[PDB]
Amino acid sequence: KLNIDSIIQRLLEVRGSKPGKNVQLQENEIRGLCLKSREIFLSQPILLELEAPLKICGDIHGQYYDLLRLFEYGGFPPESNYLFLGDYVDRGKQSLETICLLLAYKIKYPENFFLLRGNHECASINRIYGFYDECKRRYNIKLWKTFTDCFNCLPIAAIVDEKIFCCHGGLSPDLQSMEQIRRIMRPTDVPDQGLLCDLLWSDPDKDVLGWGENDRGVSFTFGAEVVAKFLHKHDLDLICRAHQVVEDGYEFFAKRQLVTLFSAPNYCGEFDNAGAMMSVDETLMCSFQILKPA
Ligand SMILES: [Mn+2]
Ligand SMILES: [Mn+2]
Numbered sequence: 001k002l003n004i005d006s007i008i009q010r011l012l013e014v015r016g017s018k019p020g021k022n023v024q025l026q027e028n029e030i031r032g033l034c035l036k037s038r039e040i041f042l043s044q045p046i047l048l049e050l051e052a053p054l055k056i057c058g059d060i061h062g063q064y065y066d067l068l069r070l071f072e073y074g075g076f077p078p079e080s081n082y083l084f085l086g087d088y089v090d091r092g093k094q095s096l097e098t099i100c101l102l103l104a105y106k107i108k109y110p111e112n113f114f115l116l117r118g119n120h121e122c123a124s125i126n127r128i129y130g131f132y133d134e135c136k137r138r139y140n141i142k143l144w145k146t147f148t149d150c151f152n153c154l155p156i157a158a159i160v161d162e163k164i165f166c167c168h169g170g171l172s173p174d175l176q177s178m179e180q181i182r183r184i185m186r187p188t189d190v191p192d193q194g195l196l197c198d199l200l201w202s203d204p205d206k207d208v209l210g211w212g213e214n215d216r217g218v219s220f221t222f223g224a225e226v227v228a229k230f231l232h233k234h235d236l237d238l239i240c241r242a243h244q245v246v247e248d249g250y251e252f253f254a255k256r257q258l259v260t261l262f263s264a265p266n267y268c269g270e271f272d273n274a275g276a277m278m279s280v281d282e283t284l285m286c287s288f289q290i291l292k293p294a
Contacts, residue, residue: 020065042153052283054279058242069275092264118168123148164239224257242263249263
């Protein structure tokens, strides 16, 4: 029943327009995106094992016209393969269009386009930071619930070519084995502590070395020694995460053993930050494309 091509065409029709212009899909169409993407998310592993070549993006937060920007720099699907690290909704003004385009591409190109869960893909959080209000304002609360059901099935982490470990937040002191991630059962809401919480909420910290307390009031911080041991233990070369704004769009930590990516330029209209996108080529060489704020 679902006309994906037409949905994608209408979402892209506003390319070039000044930021703010809405796209108005029918409720039934959005509901269809959620239900069909949810089938796909559940049919694929919770810990994705992906291969290069690949583009990797961090937080978007409903900045739809920045998402379009990313695709014009990186290549509209299927010209490149994509992995997004979560935080698609909240704070920005066009979360619906952001998430709709992402889900549409996921349905169209399920083997070449991937979405991880971020900490905002949780109903207790996106109720407060804007997605609930955007849904209510534009459609209704029932549609917001349909999105939650779909968010609850997103995968949590990826390993790219057995060398790059990717997740929204970062590491967990509870993470002894990758099998622990593969055993996480979907759908689920994100608990307030534990492994799943930490993957979506933790942060690197330059002033600690081991594990520390996190100023967010949830989860932990980790230092360079945690990072080194994790990579040595699992025979990995790099951790790739998002979750924090970085002035330059990306930022290395711990002698380039971790990188933070952030893909929303001029975040909230408040910050003066650039957005970045990481390319991994077949040789596992990492490059960056930078989108300066306009
Ligand atoms: Mn975020
Ligand atoms: Mn986050």
